[PDB]
Amino acid sequence: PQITLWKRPLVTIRIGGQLKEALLDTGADDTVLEEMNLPGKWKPKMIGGLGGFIKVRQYDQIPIEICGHKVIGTVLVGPTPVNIIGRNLLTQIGCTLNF
Amino acid sequence: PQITLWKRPLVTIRIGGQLKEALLDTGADDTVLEEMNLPGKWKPKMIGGLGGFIKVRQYDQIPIEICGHKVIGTVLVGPTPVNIIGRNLLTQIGCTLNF
Numbered sequence A, B: 001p002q003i004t005l006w007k008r009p010l011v012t013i014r015i016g017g018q019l020k021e022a023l024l025d026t027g028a029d030d031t032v033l034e035e036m037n038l039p040g041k042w043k044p045k046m047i048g049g050l051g052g053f054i055k056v057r058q059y060d061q062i063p064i065e066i067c068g069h070k071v072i073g074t075v076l077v078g079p080t081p082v083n084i085i086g087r088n089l090l091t092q093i094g095c096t097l098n099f
């Protein structure tokens, strides 16, 4: 698909049984989602935004479906105001910026 | 250009005769640059991101050259972790996401 930037690039993602809206965010190194109780080990981590850092939990090799595309990787979980699909997952769906 | 996301999408911009490195950031609504001087009246504003809100100075109708491409729009200035080109200017250069 081609996605235009007049509005926020919001898409539906599937992880487990859970469907969420998320930003295709080229400005985010890693994927960050709001509260969810994923299986597996996690490491605590801190990530820096505008306004400063927040603490997240890092979960590795998590399957995500993004616009019908199955990918697998690290999902950071914590108090992000908005669900973010970062470059770590965007690369896996073949996503480019074009102009 | 087509820009892949295995690395940060950092580009050189020209504003006010100055060359800077900025991040093409589809998750940013607005363009925020690091502390610099720009001329003309500005308005104080507050914007929010991952780790809270920051104070910025809003300058309107500012010419910027992003790669080759000329834009004229709103540039906010303050304590952003990195220079950010948001959607207000990404749209002006005809930037899309494509997978």
Ligand SMILES: CC(C)CN(C[C@@H](O)[C@H](Cc1ccccc1)NC(=O)O[C@H]1CCOC1)S(=O)(=O)c1ccc(N)cc1
Pocket (backbone or CB within 6 Å): A025, A026, A027, A028, A029, A030, A031, A032, A047, A048, A049, A050, A081, A082, A084, A086, B023, B025, B026, B027, B028, B029, B030, B031, B032, B047, B048, B049, B050, B051, B081, B082, B084, B086
């Ligand atoms: C600031 C860049 C360098 C990194 N951020 C990504 C940005 O796209 C960020 C995404 C976002 C959108 C809306 C609310 C909150 C966050 N937008 C952002 O701040 O919107 C401001 C900047 C101008 O206009 C509005 S990040 O969220 O902090 C971040 C950091 C690390 C990871 N792993 C993931 C995300």
